[PDB]
Design a protein around this nucleic acid. Sequence first.
RNA 1: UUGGCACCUCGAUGUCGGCUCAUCGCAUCCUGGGGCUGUAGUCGGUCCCAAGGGUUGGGCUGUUCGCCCAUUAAAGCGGUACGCGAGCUGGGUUCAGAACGUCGUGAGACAGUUCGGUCCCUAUCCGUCGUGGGCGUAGGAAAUUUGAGAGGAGCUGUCCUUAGUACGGGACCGGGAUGGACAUACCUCUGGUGUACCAGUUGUCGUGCCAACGGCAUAGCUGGGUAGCUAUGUGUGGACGGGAUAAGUGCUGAAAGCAUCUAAGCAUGAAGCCCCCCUCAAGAUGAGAUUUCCCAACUUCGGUUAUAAGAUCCCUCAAAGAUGAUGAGGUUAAUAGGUUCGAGGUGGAAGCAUGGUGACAUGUGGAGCUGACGAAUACUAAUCGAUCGAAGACUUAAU
Lengths: 114, 47, 215, 120, 122
Amino acid sequence: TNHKLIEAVTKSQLRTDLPSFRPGDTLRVHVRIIEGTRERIQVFEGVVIKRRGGGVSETFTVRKISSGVGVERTFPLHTPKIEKIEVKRRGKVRRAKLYYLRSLRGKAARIQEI
Amino acid sequence: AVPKRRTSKTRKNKRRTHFKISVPGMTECPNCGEYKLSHRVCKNCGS
Amino acid sequence: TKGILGRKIGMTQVFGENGELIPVTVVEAKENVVLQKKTVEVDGYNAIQVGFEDKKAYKKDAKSNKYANKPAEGHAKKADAAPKRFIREFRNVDVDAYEVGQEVSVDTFVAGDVIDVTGVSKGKGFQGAIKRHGQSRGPMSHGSHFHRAPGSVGMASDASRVFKGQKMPGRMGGNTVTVQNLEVVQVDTENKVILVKGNVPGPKKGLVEIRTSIK
Amino acid sequence: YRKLGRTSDQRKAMLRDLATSLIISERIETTEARAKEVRSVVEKLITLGKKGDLASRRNAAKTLRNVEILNEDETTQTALQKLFGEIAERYTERQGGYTRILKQGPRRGDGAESVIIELV
Amino acid sequence: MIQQETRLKVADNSGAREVLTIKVLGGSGRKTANIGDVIVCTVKNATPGGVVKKGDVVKAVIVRTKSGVRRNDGSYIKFDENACVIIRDDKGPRGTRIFGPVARELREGNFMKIVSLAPEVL
RNA sequence: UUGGCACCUCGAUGUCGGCUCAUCGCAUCCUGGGGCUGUAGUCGGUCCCAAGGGUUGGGCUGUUCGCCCAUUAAAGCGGUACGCGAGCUGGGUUCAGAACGUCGUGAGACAGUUCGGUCCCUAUCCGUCGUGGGCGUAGGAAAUUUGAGAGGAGCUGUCCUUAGUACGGGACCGGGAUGGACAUACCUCUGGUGUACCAGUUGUCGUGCCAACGGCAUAGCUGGGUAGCUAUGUGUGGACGGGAUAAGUGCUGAAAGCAUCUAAGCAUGAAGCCCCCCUCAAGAUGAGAUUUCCCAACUUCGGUUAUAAGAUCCCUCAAAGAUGAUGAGGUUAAUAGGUUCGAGGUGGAAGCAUGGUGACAUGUGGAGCUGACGAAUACUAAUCGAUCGAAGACUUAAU
């Protein structure tokens, strides 16, 4: 970080209604789906498995199993398409990136709560 | 990969135009009498 | 019309309308002052010289391009301004809406204006024929001795020589590139910065010129 | 950083040797390239010595070698002890500097610019 | 990134169980294709019965891929394996049911029939 | 093309196909204009003008050949030692081994088939791609004029509004944006790498035992990863009109009182087009170019003097780099290194305390450590110097 301009010209795009969470926690994102003309709200329940970036480029990933197939989403932390986020479970991991959950399946991919 | 014709004394002496050494800095000393290199350790230590 | 000189800071992202991500490039441009006004009855073409960065004034023993006097000083003394670091010319703007000593601000541009950025490239030094030009390599196995090297450079007996521009290895980098049809996301007057949608050529802390796209 | 025409392990070994030899006599003479690489390694060791906490002691033993210095009146002490001893006391009000480089003349065998690195 | 000689798993009850990409329609020189792209493949593994037999040349549309597509809002969505659905000539499913989730990029490809039978659409 | 002749090469002009990279033509495969049809609308038979760009992945026969599968706007024909082996392969042709069939009394022959079988060279000259030194202009620093040169140019598919009415399914007509291939710039995002960053763990050796730590085992192995470099990632481009033009369609109109695009004349008309437009390097001994600003005693300006954000030499460096060159700096100083913070990365240090028979929990604590990123601070180093240096003359006009 050389000068304090990049963080000064993007200080009006950051959010302040976001809760604190760490990789391994179960979240419930409320994405704002926009179809033909009607605006609905789709809920996506999963477990954070990544958290990189810094400032207005921060991003997070949530993994979940739909109908036997694993799905992964990734939206910018400060995105206006996210109604609100709410932590519902606090997991206990030993790393920062859980990439070993992509091969696990069944009761082997179970995370213990603190 | 082998010379087609032998080189003459003219062409050989023309290629050795930039092949030479250059005079160094040689900074004068304030109290020693002898000379020394610039930014060096001696009685002058440059000037 | 509407010309200005700025410095490339870095690259960030800004969310626009309908939550759409937009990658932008922060360009700082301040202390822009006209230095001269070329006419057609004294030079044969209308243009205006503009400065950019400032520097220290009068100095004696100074073996560095940062602070001294004489030549540059005098030319900068003609108008009411201090010595400039960079100087350029613009023959696309009107020479009747400016005055020797005016302060070119960043309020001339408005969000939604198409502009053309111009600047030198980074530089990779001596590069090969597989990097400089998009060429393919030979088999990596099957008893092959041809990898990242060029192929033939000519024919045979007929025209026994190499035509100009055979695309061979050499230094590739420092080149003047000009991206066209860009966009001004938002302009800030507090920090005097401009947000261009996309990426301009050149490295960090580099000189870049902005001009209103002709097309 | 520089590689000094050596392997990752070889380079790591040489650096440790030079540092230990610059704390034994506090005045060694070598090449310029190596003098501009050991100047940012012995400076970090002195910083650890200024702390004087147990943590630093273990952190300073991951670079310093095992040697035996001989002082006056038949007095012996390991380099580590000397680093956390007089050396630590000497520099306690100076924040930065420590080492100093002095350019010299070229060598005879080859044209290598030799220098002299000593502690201020 | 589905290209030539790529085996995908059928996600419907049309009789097929595994197909092999033969060509990616879209233009001359086209190399790879993503979700919402039509491709010509051949049945390599079928189930006893059904309407599609082994060694048949049919057309299908990708619905899931390991390398997920990127949204215009800056969002991503990758799956666990590649899958497709044997369609007809008027973008109509040859089966009657769909298994697993389906991408929301099929709505812009005029695939209402296939998007109105998928259990989940994200 | 298969041949005819035997003029260059037998003190060697050493090679069929494929690979890499190219250039040129037009007897036009695709896109563009037209004309006539025994030319229903779509669409296409033929003919004329037109060369600017673009012309795909596989299976197989031994392959130049060909046949097939699936695409595409299209999968055109040629020339350059049947382009290219001091750029690559060696499959084919192929040399010593060995089978089979026919032929021969036999050694063996066969434009029969089959398995196996060493492709040498440190670039002198011209040529090409980059990059400097020296002088010249009668010049010290900037900023430029530029038509001489190079590059790039016209591909698709839907939507939807007079009606899907003419024509008997399906037309040319102004005109926001979606794609494919290709070109160019960049690292915010998704990834890759990241051998002086952090963590886990196996064997063995060394400081009495055990530890902590260090050495070696591909970086010992495994999971992540900053800066930088990167594509499969993110942006932009190819538009536009202008001027003559080709085939052609015309309007007037004459050396047969008619006619006639013609001998004058006036129009219109192509991916035409090299022109213009757009992008890039560029003072051109046809000493050239131009503008703004800065610079004087010697002593008959003989240079005895010499000055100029005027040049170096030397030194700290990186947005630059093979070396030189270019750029950021040299004490009136933040150029590098430290030192104190910060960003990001790893993921909970040591000590102490408690819990447990023990392996191990837990708390003090988003703890501790951190190469290249950044800010602040002269603590170390860029120190006394030395050298080299614009042009103003003639002649002859007008002043």
